[model samples]
Target: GLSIDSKIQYIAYANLKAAVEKFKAKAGAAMVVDVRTGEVLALVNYPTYRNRILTDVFEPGSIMKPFTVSLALDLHRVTPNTLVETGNGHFVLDGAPITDDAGFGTLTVGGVIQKSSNIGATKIAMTMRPEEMWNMYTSIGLGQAPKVGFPGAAAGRLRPWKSWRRIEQATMSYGYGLSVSLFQLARAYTAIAHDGEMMPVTIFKTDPNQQITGTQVFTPTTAREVRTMLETVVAPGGTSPDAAVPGYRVGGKSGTAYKRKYRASFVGMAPMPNPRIVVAVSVDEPTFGGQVSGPVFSAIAGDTMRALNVPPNMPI
Candidate 1:
């Protein structure tokens, strides 16, 4: 129903193939979106079994942490510096055990995301009302069909908050109970990258001459602060330093979904604190999660930066 940039289309295809083959993954998919104009620069799906980018939905794992923390920020519930105790990174929430990969003593709100600490995320998210969390997901375009007019496009499930039990809320805080397609997840991130204005994502080419305005979901201050926090995820000692792109500062979260043979995924934007593009990658059933997907994201992101001529903010 639209046009694709052959340059980025090829870039994404080549990188996704390399990652899939090199990592021995069953499937791989990636999406690239222009931040200001809502243009889809590239869309790739390996195996060609389906248009999984639009048709498939799954739990997004730690990629959900940014949103959780962003919600807390928007609500003024916490700042990036707000500290929460994640004692031993183990606890019981509503009779269901919750744990992190390793014990964390206490982490700033941003550290929760940098470390990808489930316990830290749970505490921050649980402090809010169910309605607040549900609305954040709604505003992010999760659990809904995108208007791309792609028939059979999957509408990821988001059960009503009213029906959410304490355990469900805890799990949903870290993205266990809900689901989203990679396409939707990529679009969902535009809000963060674009200073909290979420524009419509389109497969069709758009005119740069005309102006496009998006719905504002958060104040610019909140959005920019969260963007800084997201940068930490790709910094050293974070969950996905492998996601960093050479000559470009990138911001994103890498995810490992346990419920699905370990779906490895990374969603990120580049050339920050000002960004022109958003790219997301997911490798199905990989032995390592974000570690596998992170490099794929870097490969695609670095090339896409060049294709768009986004001048490198960092040194080459």
Candidate 2:
């Protein structure tokens, strides 16, 4: 295991940031860990001299769904294949109309996740009590301040229950009402990435960092189950088939949270068949109408996996 600020971490981080910056990335967010050993492989924030300070708050949008789904699955609140009747793009929750940008009628739990279906998520959120949902959020570290060895990290925006309007609750369900930093977003998924455990997110790893164990939030069964739903996302007819790497299985959600039709993103991992690395990419209002970002991640991740000779997760 490498120490924080060690040669190994620097090399990996530098290479990653360079790979993105070379393409004119205004910024980058990244983390690499050894799931088996909990070794921090890389932690990088780009935009040279940004100091990697994670203080800015952005609406996580659909990126928040994974945390919500984890809570649901853990409470035995919902199943992976549970059919969530989207009510055809219009589902009211807490007096809010949760509709889809694209018309998709009904979707399964997996489908809602992949398609980022607001209507479907609204139904799911409405079925659960607000406090219970809030508790689940707490359990998964939402709104909890991170301690990842950063100098100026801010706790994500989490309004008190009393402050939440019905509309706010509805939007928060699919990642709208609240705001979170990039590191917190990654922390939320550590449970999914590390077998349903809340793996500690660290910025500075001590030299010879031991594989740190995490607090168990879900069963191994839950972790595997969530992985399947995430996998469906990169399959055909899924939101991001472009993210699909031919040789291995990869799973994650695509996000287009720009209210002004700007800044599209594909934040997930590649080389899915074996699940070695977790990858994320975002375009801060690309010139080509956001079409440029998705393809950018795919090309980079695909080439990286191929060059590493990472065996395909599934048959091509």
Give TM per candidate.
Answer: 0.96, 0.82
Alpha-carbon local distance difference test for all models: 0.87, 0.63
Which digits, one per residue and each the tens of the lDDT, describe model 2 over residues 1-316?
3333344345445544654555565565555444444445555556546334267566777776766676677778788888888655766655656778677876778788878788777667766667777776776676766665556677777888766676777788888877666656656666677677766665444445455667787787777777777787777766667667666677776665565345455555555424555555555534342244445445545555665567665787
Candidate with top lDDT is 1
Tens digits of lDDT, candidate 1, 115-215: 98989989998889999899989988888888887788998999998999988888888888999999988988999999899878998877768878777
lDDT of 2: 0.63
Candidate 1 vs. true structure, TM-score = 0.96
> Number of clashing pairs, model 2?
13
lDDT score, residue 158, model 2?
Answer: 81
